[PDB]
Amino acid sequence: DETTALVCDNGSGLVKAGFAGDDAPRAVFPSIVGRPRHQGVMVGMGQKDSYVGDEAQSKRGILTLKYPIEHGIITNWDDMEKIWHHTFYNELRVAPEEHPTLLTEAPLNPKANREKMTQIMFETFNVPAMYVAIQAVLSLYASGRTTGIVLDSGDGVTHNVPIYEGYALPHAIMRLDLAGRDLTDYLMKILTERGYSFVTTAEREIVRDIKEKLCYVALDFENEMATAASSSSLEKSYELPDGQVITIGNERFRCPETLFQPSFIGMESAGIHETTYNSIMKCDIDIRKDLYANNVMSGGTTMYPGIADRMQKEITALAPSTMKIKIIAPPERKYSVWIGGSILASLSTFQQMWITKQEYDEAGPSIVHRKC
Amino acid sequence: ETTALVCDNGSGLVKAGFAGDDAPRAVFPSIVGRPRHQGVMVGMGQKDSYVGDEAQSKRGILTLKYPIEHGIITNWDDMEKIWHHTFYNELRVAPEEHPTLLTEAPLNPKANREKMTQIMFETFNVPAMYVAIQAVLSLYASGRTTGIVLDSGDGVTHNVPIYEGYALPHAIMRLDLAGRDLTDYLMKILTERGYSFVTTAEREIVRDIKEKLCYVALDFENEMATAASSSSLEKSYELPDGQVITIGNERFRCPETLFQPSFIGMESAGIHETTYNSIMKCDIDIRKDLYANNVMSGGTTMYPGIADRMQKEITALAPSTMKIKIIAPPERKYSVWIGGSILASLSTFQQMWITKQEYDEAGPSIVHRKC
Amino acid sequence: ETTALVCDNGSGLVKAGFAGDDAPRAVFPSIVGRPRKDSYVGDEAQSKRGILTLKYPIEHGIITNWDDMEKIWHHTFYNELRVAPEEHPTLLTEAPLNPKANREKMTQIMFETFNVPAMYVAIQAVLSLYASGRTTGIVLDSGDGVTHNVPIYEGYALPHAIMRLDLAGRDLTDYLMKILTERGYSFVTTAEREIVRDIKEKLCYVALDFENEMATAASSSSLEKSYELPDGQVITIGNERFRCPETLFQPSFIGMESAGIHETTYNSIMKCDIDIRKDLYANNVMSGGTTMYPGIADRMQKEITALAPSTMKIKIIAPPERKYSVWIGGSILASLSTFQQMWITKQEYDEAGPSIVHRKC
Amino acid sequence: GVQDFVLLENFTSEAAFIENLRRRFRENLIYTYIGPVLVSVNPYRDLQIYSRQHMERYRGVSFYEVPPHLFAVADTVYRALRTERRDQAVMISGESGAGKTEATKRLLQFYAETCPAPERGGAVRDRLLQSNPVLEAFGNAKTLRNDNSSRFGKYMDVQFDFKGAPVGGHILSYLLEKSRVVHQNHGERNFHVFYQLLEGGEEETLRRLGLERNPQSYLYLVKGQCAKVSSINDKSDWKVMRKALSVIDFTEDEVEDLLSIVASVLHLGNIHFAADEDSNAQVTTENQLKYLTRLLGVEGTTLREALTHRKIIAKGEELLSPLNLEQAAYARDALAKAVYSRTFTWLVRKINRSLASKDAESPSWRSTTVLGLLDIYGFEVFQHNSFEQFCINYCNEKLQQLFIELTLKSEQEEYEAEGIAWEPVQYFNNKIICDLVEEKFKGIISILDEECLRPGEATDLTFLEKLEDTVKPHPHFLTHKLADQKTRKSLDRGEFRLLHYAGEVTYSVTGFLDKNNDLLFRNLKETMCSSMNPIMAQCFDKSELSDKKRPETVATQFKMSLLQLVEILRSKEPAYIRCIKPNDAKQPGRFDEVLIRHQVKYLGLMENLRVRRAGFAYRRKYEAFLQRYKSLCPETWPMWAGRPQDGVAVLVRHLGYKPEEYKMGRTKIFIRFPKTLFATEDSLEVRRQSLATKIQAAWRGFHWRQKFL
Amino acid sequence: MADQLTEEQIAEFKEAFSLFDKDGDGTITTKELGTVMRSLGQNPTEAELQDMINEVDADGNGTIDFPEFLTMMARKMKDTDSEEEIREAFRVFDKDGNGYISAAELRHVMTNLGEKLTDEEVDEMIREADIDGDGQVNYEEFVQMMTA
Numbered sequence A: 001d002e003t004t005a006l007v008c009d010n011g012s013g014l015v016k017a018g019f020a021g022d023d024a025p026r027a028v029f030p031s032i033v034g035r036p037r038h039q040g041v042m043v044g045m046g047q048k049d050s051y052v053g054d055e056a057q058s059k060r061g062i063l064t065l066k067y068p069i070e071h072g073i074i075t076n077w078d079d080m081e082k083i084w085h086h087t088f089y090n091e092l093r094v095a096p097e098e099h100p101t102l103l104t105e106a107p108l109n110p111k112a113n114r115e116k117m118t119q120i121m122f123e124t125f126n127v128p129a130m131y132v133a134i135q136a137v138l139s140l141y142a143s144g145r146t147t148g149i150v151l152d153s154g155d156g157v158t159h160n161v162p163i164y165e166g167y168a169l170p171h172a173i174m175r176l177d178l179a180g181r182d183l184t185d186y187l188m189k190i191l192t193e194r195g196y197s198f199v200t201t202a203e204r205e206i207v208r209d210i211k212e213k214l215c216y217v218a219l220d221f222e223n224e225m226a227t228a229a230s231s232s233s234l235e236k237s238y239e240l241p242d243g244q245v246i247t248i249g250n251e252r253f254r255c256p257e258t259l260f261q262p263s264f265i266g267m268e269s270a271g272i273h274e275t276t277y278n279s280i281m282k283c284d285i286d287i288r289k290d291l292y293a294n295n296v297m298s299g300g301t302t303m304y305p306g307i308a309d310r311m312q313k314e315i316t317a318l319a320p321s322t323m324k325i326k327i328i329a330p331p332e333r334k335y336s337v338w339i340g341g342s343i344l345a346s347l348s349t350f351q352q353m354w355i356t357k358q359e360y361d362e363a364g365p366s367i368v369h370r371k372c
Numbered sequence B: 001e002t003t004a005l006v007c008d009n010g011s012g013l014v015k016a017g018f019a020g021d022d023a024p025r026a027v028f029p030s031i032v033g034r035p036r037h038q039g040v041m042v043g044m045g046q047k048d049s050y051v052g053d054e055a056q057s058k059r060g061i062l063t064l065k066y067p068i069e070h071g072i073i074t075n076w077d078d079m080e081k082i083w084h085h086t087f088y089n090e091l092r093v094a095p096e097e098h099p100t101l102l103t104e105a106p107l108n109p110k111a112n113r114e115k116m117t118q119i120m121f122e123t124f125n126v127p128a129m130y131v132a133i134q135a136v137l138s139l140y141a142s143g144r145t146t147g148i149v150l151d152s153g154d155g156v157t158h159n160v161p162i163y164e165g166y167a168l169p170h171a172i173m174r175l176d177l178a179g180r181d182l183t184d185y186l187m188k189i190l191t192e193r194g195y196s197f198v199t200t201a202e203r204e205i206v207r208d209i210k211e212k213l214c215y216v217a218l219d220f221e222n223e224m225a226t227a228a229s230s231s232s233l234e235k236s237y238e239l240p241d242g243q244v245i246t247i248g249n250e251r252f253r254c255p256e257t258l259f260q261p262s263f264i265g266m267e268s269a270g271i272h273e274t275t276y277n278s279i280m281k282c283d284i285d286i287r288k289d290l291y292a293n294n295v296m297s298g299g300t301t302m303y304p305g306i307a308d309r310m311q312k313e314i315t316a317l318a319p320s321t322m323k324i325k326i327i328a329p330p331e332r333k334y335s336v337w338i339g340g341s342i343l344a345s346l347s348t349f350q351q352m353w354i355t356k357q358e359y360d361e362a363g364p365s366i367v368h369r370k371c
Numbered sequence C: 001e002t003t004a005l006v007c008d009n010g011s012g013l014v015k016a017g018f019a020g021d022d023a024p025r026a027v028f029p030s031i032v033g034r035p036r037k038d039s040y041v042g043d044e045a046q047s048k049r050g051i052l053t054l055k056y057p058i059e060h061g062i063i064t065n066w067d068d069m070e071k072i073w074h075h076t077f078y079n080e081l082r083v084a085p086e087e088h089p090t091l092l093t094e095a096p097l098n099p100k101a102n103r104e105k106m107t108q109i110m111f112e113t114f115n116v117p118a119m120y121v122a123i124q125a126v127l128s129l130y131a132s133g134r135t136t137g138i139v140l141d142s143g144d145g146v147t148h149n150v151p152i153y154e155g156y157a158l159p160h161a162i163m164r165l166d167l168a169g170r171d172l173t174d175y176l177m178k179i180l181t182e183r184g185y186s187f188v189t190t191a192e193r194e195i196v197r198d199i200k201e202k203l204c205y206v207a208l209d210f211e212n213e214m215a216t217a218a219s220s221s222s223l224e225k226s227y228e229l230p231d232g233q234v235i236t237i238g239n240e241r242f243r244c245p246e247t248l249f250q251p252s253f254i255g256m257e258s259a260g261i262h263e264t265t266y267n268s269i270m271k272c273d274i275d276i277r278k279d280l281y282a283n284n285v286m287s288g289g290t291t292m293y294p295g296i297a298d299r300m301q302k303e304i305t306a307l308a309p310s311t312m313k314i315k316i317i318a319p320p321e322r323k324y325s326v327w328i329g330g331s332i333l334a335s336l337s338t339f340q341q342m343w344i345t346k347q348e349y350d351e352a353g354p355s356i357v358h359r360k361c
Numbered sequence D: 001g002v003q004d005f006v007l008l009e010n011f012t013s014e015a016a017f018i019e020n021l022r023r024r025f026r027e028n029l030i031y032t033y034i035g036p037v038l039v040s041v042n043p044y045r046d047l048q049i050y051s052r053q054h055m056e057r058y059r060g061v062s063f064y065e066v067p068p069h070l071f072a073v074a075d076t077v078y079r080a081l082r083t084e085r086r087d088q089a090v091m092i093s094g095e096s097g098a099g100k101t102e103a104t105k106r107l108l109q110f111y112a113e114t115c116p117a118p119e120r121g122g123a124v125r126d127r128l129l130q131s132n133p134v135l136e137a138f139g140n141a142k143t144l145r146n147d148n149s150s151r152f153g154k155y156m157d158v159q160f161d162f163k164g165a166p167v168g169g170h171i172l173s174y175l176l177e178k179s180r181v182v183h184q185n186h187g188e189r190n191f192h193v194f195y196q197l198l199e200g201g202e203e204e205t206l207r208r209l210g211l212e213r214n215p216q217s218y219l220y221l222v223k224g225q226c227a228k229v230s231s232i233n234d235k236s237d238w239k240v241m242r243k244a245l246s247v248i249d250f251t252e253d254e255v256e257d258l259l260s261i262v263a264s265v266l267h268l269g270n271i272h273f274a275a276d277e278d279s280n281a282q283v284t285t286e287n288q289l290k291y292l293t294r295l296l297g298v299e300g301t302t303l304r305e306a307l308t309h310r311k312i313i314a315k316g317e318e319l320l321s322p323l324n325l326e327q328a329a330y331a332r333d334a335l336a337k338a339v340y341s342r343t344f345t346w347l348v349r350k351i352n353r354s355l356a357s358k359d360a361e362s363p364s365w366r367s368t369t370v371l372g373l374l375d376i377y378g379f380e381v382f383q384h385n386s387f388e389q390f391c392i393n394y395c396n397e398k399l400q401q402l403f404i405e406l407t408l409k410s411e412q413e414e415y416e417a418e419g420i421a422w423e424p425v426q427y428f429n430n431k432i433i434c435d436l437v438e439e440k441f442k443g444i445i446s447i448l449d450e451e452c453l454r455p456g457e458a459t460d461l462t463f464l465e466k467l468e469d470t471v472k473p474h475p476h477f478l479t480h481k482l483a484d485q486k487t488r489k490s491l492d493r494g495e496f497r498l499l500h501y502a503g504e505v506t507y508s509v510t511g512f513l514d515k516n517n518d519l520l521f522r523n524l525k526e527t528m529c530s531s532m533n534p535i536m537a538q539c540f541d542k543s544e545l546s547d548k549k550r551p552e553t554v555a556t557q558f559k560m561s562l563l564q565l566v567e568i569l570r571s572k573e574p575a576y577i578r579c580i581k582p583n584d585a586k587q588p589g590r591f592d593e594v595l596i597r598h599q600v601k602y603l604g605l606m607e608n609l610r611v612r613r614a615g616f617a618y619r620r621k622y623e624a625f626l627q628r629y630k631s632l633c634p635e636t637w638p639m640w641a642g643r644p645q646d647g648v649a650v651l652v653r654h655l656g657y658k659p660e661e662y663k664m665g666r667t668k669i670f671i672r673f674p675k676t677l678f679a680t681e682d683s684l685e686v687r688r689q690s691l692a693t694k695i696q697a698a699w700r701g702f703h704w705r706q707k708f709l
Numbered sequence E: 001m002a003d004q005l006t007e008e009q010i011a012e013f014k015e016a017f018s019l020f021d022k023d024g025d026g027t028i029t030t031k032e033l034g035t036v037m038r039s040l041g042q043n044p045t046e047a048e049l050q051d052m053i054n055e056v057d058a059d060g061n062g063t064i065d066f067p068e069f070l071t072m073m074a075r076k077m078k079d080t081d082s083e084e085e086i087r088e089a090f091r092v093f094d095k096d097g098n099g100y101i102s103a104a105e106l107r108h109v110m111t112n113l114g115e116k117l118t119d120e121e122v123d124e125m126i127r128e129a130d131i132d133g134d135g136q137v138n139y140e141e142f143v144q145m146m147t148a
């Protein structure tokens, strides 16, 4: 495509990338760089120093896999440039020199994370203009709403942004460094109870697939525990890559329950239901009622079966009995940040919001803090 | 032994002792701490909970809680542990011997006094008690019959104008922003350098950073420009595990919230405007003397430069012929204590204490007739 | 009599005795050997190993052969300690992140095979703090089958900060069997694996700087040592003495992806709360037999000093009795007056079945 | 006043007991009974009551007939050793200065002068008594209460053959307060031998040992700050003590070995430990070790190691593990306590083997039977009480439990044997407070044994906090936390109160963990049984290294050794003498009621009287009762032709006893109120007028026919 | 009533009485009734002799006649004290029951109790109650002597 914007949701777990004005991301792949563990022994092949995304998942038995993003912060900048080069050259197949690029970020991130995204886009990729949107603000453009509280959860961050009539309330923004990778590390810990030992970075990706397929949220957790103690009716099974069958029971709701009980992974924080209610209770007069009725959910760790019924129950239990608690959890919610980023980057009134390379030449990487 | 006890039940620090002392004998965090984790060593002598300096010493294994929020007691079962610890562990007294002076902020819920009164007479069996107002006690420590007191605690900031010993209760102003809100905002602004503090134990580390490194800028936009252009304002702090923090404009962003409450997203006027609005709500004949007697007290007034910025800001609000003075004594963290030791030693005030006879005659509503 | 029994069911050695004692009475390899009696256990299996296949019923701290493990518990009680277990409450041990069926089947065999009056299963690294005299510290326990880290503060475990590594003394014995083939020595049978364990126990040590000991061993014979095999042949070994224990610090020598014991210790400390870490750095406790190498406390101190902030003091508690701190800690625990309310009794097992271990332990 | 306290009309009154003691003592009647027990009040005088004419008066008649004397107990216990031929104890009890050593000397004087081989009996007496300065020097100390209090239980047999002749004796020492060797409370000294050596010792004697005569030069002498006091002459006492060792057949080289142990104990307390860079202990001062390697006779490289390492042995490998400063101080103090209590056990063995039978005493020899004297410390309440008072008062609790059990059992088995229905007595149950101290996983000693053993920074206040949590609802326990606001004025923080049989006692917990630790590791024992010193090579033996247990705490060793003293005392037939010091001034005639009230309570004499009285004051076989009182009832006089029981049955109708005042057993009459017995002996007193009248009329009817006609 | 004197016994009592009568007036002194009765070996007490004299000293003259003496003799002869009774009376004063009493304790019970022995009666008693010189009386042999 010739003159469109690029929208690139660089989440902690997956890169989701595409053009603005599309319905969905063209490239969706793991936010992973993989490097070989072993020495190559047939000196007769083109073997890379490193592999990215779906190259690396196909190779992963011989690789060690590393995520450059952890808790929404780019911890390795060489591996992140390898991911962005793969995203543009291999996956989208674009010159980024020709496209304004919308990036996304969690709220309450280190300021250095935007400045280095900015510096790398203008100095390395020679992007003509660039912007960094807050991820939970994007899921409202996808929802067709000016008002709502948004729970967004990815691989590394859960965050709660309340917005009323198009205004964000930045004192009421909650952030929880607990999401999909934390629930995966806790499922690897739980799986040891049946003797299934997963420890390598490739086995972390096997357990990530178990969580994505078998796990669900209990409507009443103690009644599901009582049901799993007294029957096999909650047990399911999983063929591992080498043909071994796992069988799993209460492990499949104890993993997701860590969202409602952060103390399972040793954290002191309130659960996602309390964090959502506490973010509503930080807000103004007429606006509490409209946040309860527009409680939007976003990002991949909101995809467990039953999590909207659990959230609607737990928030109904905290809020007044006359409030209409209503949870917006669409089927497409796994891509809601990218979908909403496609809308933002398309809007006529957004086209003056971009940081142009002229503005980055006048003032250095610190330009993001004025513009975004 | 029948000396009066005094407790300044502050929102963040208990400050307690006897009338006729110069300073509190007990000064400890108003916290209860409960084990977060599985107790694994047997015979250790572990406890269901810890209080004050015990909880502040064991933070990494405890969920810390304050039973007071915004100067209101919100958890009475824990507030009883703090009072029991005050008498039995810190002061080492029987409360049944000593008339007890308590403190609270103005514009509090009426049930807070009644439930303080009931707990003192029915749980601690005190012979008598009284509930003084914190900013009124702060004029006793100053030796003044006249002035406007800015008292800023851990939970509440309040302004009380007094003229010749008469409070003007319609001109009293309260602002539920103080040192805990500044700590929660310092936790927010510290994430911009990537320092993440989130647990109730880390909230105490951020409180200690706030106490040691923060100051009030004489012109915030000029200090922001000084930080944007040099390292000269940056200071390091070493954390409990030896990691070294460094902060810059965060040192004056945090305190400036008192002058700009919109940093918390609050609509309210700043502490300079709230002082001037409280003076302007008084009678015209009393204002000249109130401007010359701004008494600052409580630990949230302890920032370097706050008496200079507060004088500068009130001087720009008040008429150019007025003689604005701010009283910022080195002991101003204890003026509610020092005031309570004075207004408990005074002979003319020994008729004022609520006796257990009057509480038995009238029930817990007696505080609204006596205080 | 009727004092408590204490068994460290180690992967490689049984240590067994009574809660009143300084040290275990029975210390023998956790082995059953069969011909090539129908079977021999412990020191009789080592004594006859030239005509036997020797099998360990524990691998990586998990009991993998229960009929052989009953032979070892029977040998412990009736041959080695000379007791009836029906008369004595029994303290057993386990690694932290084991399968649940391992405890339940321990528990069932104690109450239904050995008719034990009461028992408990304790975490090995938790016991190792009692012998150390400490209620705060991070314990690196490392035995024949498992290496594990448990951080404890003011007597509370931080169970999310517990780390496990399925690499210890047997993986090093199997690595020494591999790297000794480079000099031309071939050790293959289950008896030759025990000869190589006896070499590893006498010749190996941990280099304080691996590239500098590799440069030393490549430039002189000053590191070379000699071992007489049981038929009177002579081994010479050099570079291999510190190459083998280096695998605790570079697990990639096994082909494992894991971080070393120094990094795995630091990763536990950095999973604990900020306020805890200073006291954990001053209380790194080492226990179990693979912490017995010459130079390993100096290497662990060097490596954790480099990972930790420069103002922290790192101390490493590596007692001379390291190999027995789990059993010594079990003797202390089973002797505490407060612990006597914490046994699982047969009256509770007769109500709850084997599932009782997860409520009590 | 009444000779036997079970005849007291208001036997439930402490003030009526103390008034009858005062009335008898004013009258110079220094002895009373309580059933078979004797009470003695110290006369502070050479009263002629012990002279030969009283020995021959008391030889042959029991405690149930002759008026109270030490020689009534002496006869009773000796004729039991002739008649029942079960072995015997007399327990001498009460305060130091209450006359316990004078009672012990006069019991051994009676068993010398009244027995059929007086030259061998007098020799065993002299060997028992001439050993006193030595046992007192090594085993008494100055306390806050007395300048010469015994700090051990001292047992002394005289051993008799089938002929009732003394063939030998024994000495055994129990429960020595060995915590004193290394620590003292303020105002208390160590055992007397140290100050006696430093002040009394010769120049070469001191010079060969540690030679500085100032006692503040040694840490183990000065913790109580009491070294010089005008009432004690240490110089003069050592010149008497050193001669007692010569007279009791210690050769000069044994005394030089023994002084070398006493000076070794002084040097051990002067060892100071510094830390390594690893916090392991190192001995800083060579100057104590320069002497200890000569005086203990051990190699200095071995002793340096044993003071600073604990040795484990596992799979035949032996593993030296280093001690931290707290463990190295406890190891130095454990060695000093062990080396001192073992040289005292060796002194008692070396004395005791000089008392043994010279004839073979072995089959086909006919029989041998021992009569013992046990003298163990009384109950102990001071201004401040601590770990040694707790042990002494637990010992006395456990002996009061045994005593009241045997007293109650003796009254119950009498009423059952005589066929009287047991009228119920309710008495202070000592079992409940022994269980509070000693019950296996919930008593104070077990909670204290846990607090010395368990990991982390355990403290005396942490031990109190665990007692408060685990003893909690118990009726005989209290602390400032558990106290109500009224009792919380009397009882401080850092203290617990036990309700004992002798009343409430309050223990300060400070030093409970320091005094209960006894870390004599096998490494120290192995070092000492390798010693070149002839005493120490007998005190530590190679067979003791076969024990695989951890070191037992002092309270555990004390519990076990006290349980062994109790099972010894259940096996013997016990008699009891209970001693009262009538004022603290050592003054004749003065009865200090306030001090006597404490002693009568400490001795538990009111609980004894209650349990001994039970249903009825007095009982006697009808055969004896009828012969005394038949003269009041003419139908029975001068002889009754029927059974004695039926003769008493008519006589008590003639005297006019009411049906509730008496009962009739199988062979004994029982009298309920001593009102009835006294009104009967008063009726007999007015009837003696008639008996004299009859003799005078019979004399005049004869004498007239002698002087006339 | 209960017993009656024989004419020969009356003549033997008159023969003994004649030594005190002497002049033939047929009468004895009121202080002397005990002397004439004790001459026949009777054991009257001083209280019995006072109770006797109270009924016969009706009109003075310091004396009592043979008929009233013989009447008072017939009163005393009904129920005289026995050998076994006087032996048992000493057995009640014996502190041990062994058959011996001290001369000092005999002097006590003969002079601190009623109807006291005079110092003449005590010292002449003790002179032969001290039978073999140890200071004790075998009271059973002393009663076998005294009942002769």
Ligand SMILES: Nc1ncnc2c1ncn2[C@@H]1O[C@H](COP(=O)(O)OP(=O)(O)O)[C@@H](O)[C@H]1O
Pocket: A010, A011, A012, A013, A014, A015, A153, A154, A155, A156, A179, A180, A181, A208, A211, A212, A213, A299, A300, A301, A303, A304, A334
């Ligand atoms: N169906 C699912 N059920 C549970 N977890 C899911 C599901 N689909 C994706 N996830 C998890 O959610 C995370 C992906 O969410 P996403 O928003 O795409 O992550 P990120 O924003 O960090 O790139 C991963 O941890 C993934 O395993």
Ligand SMILES: Nc1ncnc2c1ncn2[C@@H]1O[C@H](COP(=O)(O)OP(=O)(O)O)[C@@H](O)[C@H]1O
Pocket: B009, B010, B011, B012, B013, B014, B152, B153, B154, B155, B156, B178, B179, B180, B207, B210, B211, B212, B297, B298, B299, B300, B301, B302, B303, B304, B333
């Ligand atoms: N040096 C300081 N600089 C700034 N703030 C301080 C300083 N010392 C204490 N504070 C803050 O003051 C508050 C405690 O003040 P205080 O008057 O005692 O409050 P309260 O009465 O509510 O308990 C806390 O938030 C504390 O962090």
Ligand SMILES: Nc1ncnc2c1ncn2[C@@H]1O[C@H](COP(=O)(O)OP(=O)(O)O)[C@@H](O)[C@H]1O
Pocket: C008, C009, C010, C011, C012, C013, C014, C142, C143, C144, C145, C146, C168, C169, C170, C173, C197, C200, C201, C202, C204, C287, C288, C289, C290, C292, C293, C323
């Ligand atoms: N001196 C030593 N040097 C090196 N390794 C040793 C030494 N002593 C024992 N080991 C090794 O320690 C391991 C046994 O440790 P142990 O604590 O007894 O393990 P476990 O509890 O699992 O049985 C064996 O692999 C053994 O070879």
Ligand SMILES: [Mg+2]
Pocket: A011, A153, A154, A155, A299, A300, A337
């Ligand atoms: Mg996402």
Ligand SMILES: [Mg+2]
Pocket: B010, B011, B134, B152, B153, B154, B298, B299, B336
């Ligand atoms: Mg305040």
Ligand SMILES: [Mg+2]
Pocket: C008, C009, C010, C011, C124, C143, C288, C326
């Ligand atoms: Mg082991």
